[PDB]
Amino acid sequence: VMTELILHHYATSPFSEKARLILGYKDQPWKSVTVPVILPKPDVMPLTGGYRRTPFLQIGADIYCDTALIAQVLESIHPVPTLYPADRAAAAFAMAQWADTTLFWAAASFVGQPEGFKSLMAGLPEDFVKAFVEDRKAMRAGGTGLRTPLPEAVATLQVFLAQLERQFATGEHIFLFGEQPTIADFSVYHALWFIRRATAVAGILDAHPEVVAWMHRMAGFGHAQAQPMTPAEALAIARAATPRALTDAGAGADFDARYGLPKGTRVTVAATDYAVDPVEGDLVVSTRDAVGVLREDPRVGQVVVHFPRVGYAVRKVE
Amino acid sequence: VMTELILHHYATSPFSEKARLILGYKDQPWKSVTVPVILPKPDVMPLTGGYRRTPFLQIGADIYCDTALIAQVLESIHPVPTLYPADRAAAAFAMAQWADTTLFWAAASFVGQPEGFKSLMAGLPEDFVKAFVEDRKAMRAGGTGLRTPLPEAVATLQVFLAQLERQFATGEHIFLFGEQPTIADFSVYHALWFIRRATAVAGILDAHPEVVAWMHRMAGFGHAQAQPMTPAEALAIARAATPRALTDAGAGADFDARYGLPKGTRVTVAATDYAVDPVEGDLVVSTRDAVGVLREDPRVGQVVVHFPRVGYAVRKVE
Ligand SMILES: N[C@@H](CCC(=O)N[C@@H](CS)C(=O)NCC(=O)O)C(=O)O
Ligand SMILES: N[C@@H](CCC(=O)N[C@@H](CS)C(=O)NCC(=O)O)C(=O)O
Ligand SMILES: [Zn+2]
Ligand SMILES: [Zn+2]
Ligand SMILES: [Zn+2]
Ligand SMILES: [Zn+2]
Ligand SMILES: [Zn+2]
Ligand SMILES: [Zn+2]
Ligand SMILES: [Zn+2]
Ligand SMILES: [Zn+2]
């Protein structure tokens, strides 16, 4: 079987929680593959070609990185109930972007303060904690994101939570845009879920009762039905599979060349905010919102690795 | 008279256009004070204490910097029609933030390309153009914002414009959240207005007919009624006036000390994204969303300079 949805993630990851909750909302069964929290990730690299962030979605030999894109893929498969109401398209898109960048960075900083950090690392060996701290520092080497100072983090949280509370207090809708959550609900949710996990500093949430109630409604979607799969099993599946763009049916798909890179061009794709690890391959998938690069790994053969455009940089190799 | 609304701005400034359009929407008469496009600004510094960005709103001896805060002040004065519908509070706040940062930075980069830049500088002396280029480079010295590379700028614009077009094409509402514009409409608008001004590259807008129609509806609000005032007249007015926090009525206003800086503390306030010029004074105004610092200038006496919290950093002087 090479059409199962295989999510590569770990339990304590907020961005992984976002994807798992969306899976619940879509009532989409999936396979669960645990990845390491820190480098190195030798069972991950043959799939992603260097991208080390979590989570990513594997379907056969197609590897979809970033939750903004994973959500779009899941929407493609089960469009109902939708994450992207047409009548809220721009507002939901922009709010989700802000939530998954600026808001998340404030939550990370807020939780990174001494009491918060102590709460997060509570049941873990001191070896791992030190390595985690070093791993995340190296992760910030190339970018601009995920380095909001504590005082600005606190203000962004206080200001935003009050606006969130105000909106919900009107009692007009149970989610941000109506009686169904949108992508923006999920993006905001995991940032706040991360704070809730930082037990010693979670009190900031409790000062906002309506926000807490909304979180409870979001949590109710669950994570659908999952079964574990080993990292090795996932690699075998990618190896046996042919990427969609290389099948006779998928090869005729429209290729957006307006961006000035023709099909087949050797490129790299890299995140721009942090973890700026370049992934190299041939540009074989190009849409308005996303790209896909064909690469060849000795252990999985050919895979195509997909990224959204926003938050990433595509450059010609030369 | 020391209760007129005095906007310090210049014609070609997108952020100034945002404030002027909001003034039209509120039907709020104002006084117009032209400031220089580039440094130095000796008629501005006695008011702002170092903040060199445009626009700012003066009311007597209170100086309100940043359009996010100017909008809140204008809302305080004419709350109807509102910019901040309670039932859309968080969505409008977040979307406006994203529009006034990420989206604006993509528009700036997009317009900064050779043909775009040529269009913008068309009727201007080559002296000024060179100085402008140097001025804006020095402006980016301390921050992270306003440096989106052209290819990423193009993708952010294409992706967002399609979502905007999709939302409007449903025909459900004439503005982003209903039959009245919100703060988010104004924030998105000026970024696109800036692109429209870059004649040679404005065609990107025309590929999105519904977005163009929405821009036309926004433009219709006009700029209310304005009269010119000289920079010197504005300085005299600040000089004669007493800041609200120093009046008997305003002195009892609630002071938010939860952020850990008591009233009277000597601080600096500085933008975090670009133009990171620190403004020093005593912290005498503190709310959840904003701060105000009392300073003394030999030429205007005491003024209080106000900033929003989000996008700024407040630090104790020592
Ligand atoms: N924009 C990315 C952000 C992903 C992200 O930052 N994930 C965190 C985990 S919560 C991460 O990658 N940490 C480094 C790692 O997993 O090795 C997305 O939406 O998927
Ligand atoms: N966040 C600020 C941004 C203001 C801004 O960047 N203004 C531009 C003018 S369009 C600027 O300050 N350029 C430098 C200058 O005016 O000297 C706001 O919303 O007011
Ligand atoms: Zn994480
Ligand atoms: Zn969970
Ligand atoms: Zn299904
Ligand atoms: Zn097994
Ligand atoms: Zn400008
Ligand atoms: Zn105008
Ligand atoms: Zn009035
Ligand atoms: Zn006069």
Structural domains in chain B, CATH included, are 1-86+221-318 (3.40.30.110), 87-220 (1.20.1050.10)
Q: Measured between alpha carbons, how far is A112 from B5 in angstroms, rounded to an integer?
A: 43
Helical spans, DSSP H, in A99-182: 104-112, 114-120, 126-139, 150-169
Beta sheet of B30-34, edge-to-edge order? B226-228, B30-34, B6-9, B56-59, B62-65, B301-308, B290-297, B279-286, B266-271, B312-316
Cα–chain-centroid distance for residue B275? Answer: 13
Structure tokens given for B253: 């206003």
Q: What is the CA radius of gyration of chain A?
A: 20
- Looking at the partner chain, which of A91, A170, A289 has a beta carbon nearest the beta carbon of B95? A91
Kindly provide the resolution of this structure in angstroms, with one decimal: 2.3
Q: Is the peptide bond before B36 cis (omega within 30 degrees of 0)?
A: no
Q: Which of residues 168-187 of B touch A (CB under 8 A)?
A: 169-170, 172-173, 176-177, 184
Omega before residue B243 within 30° of 0, cis: no
Ligand closest to Cα of B57 equals 2
User: ω into residue B81 within 30 of 0, thus cis?
Assistant: yes
Exp. method = X-ray
Alpha-carbon distance of A39 to B154, in angstroms, equals 33
Distance between CA A159 and CA A177 in Å, rounded?
A: 20
| 3-class secondary structure, A173 | coil
In angstroms, the CA B148 to CA A185 distance is 27
The rounded Å distance from CA A313 to ligand 2 centre is 26
Is A316 near chain B, with CB under 8 Å? no
Backbone angles phi, psi at B3, to 5 degrees: -125, 10
Residue of chain A nearest B164, judged by CA positions? A90
Query: Please, which residues bridge with residue A301 across strands?
Result: A297
How far apart (Å, rounded) are the C-alpha atoms in residues B238 and B46?
10
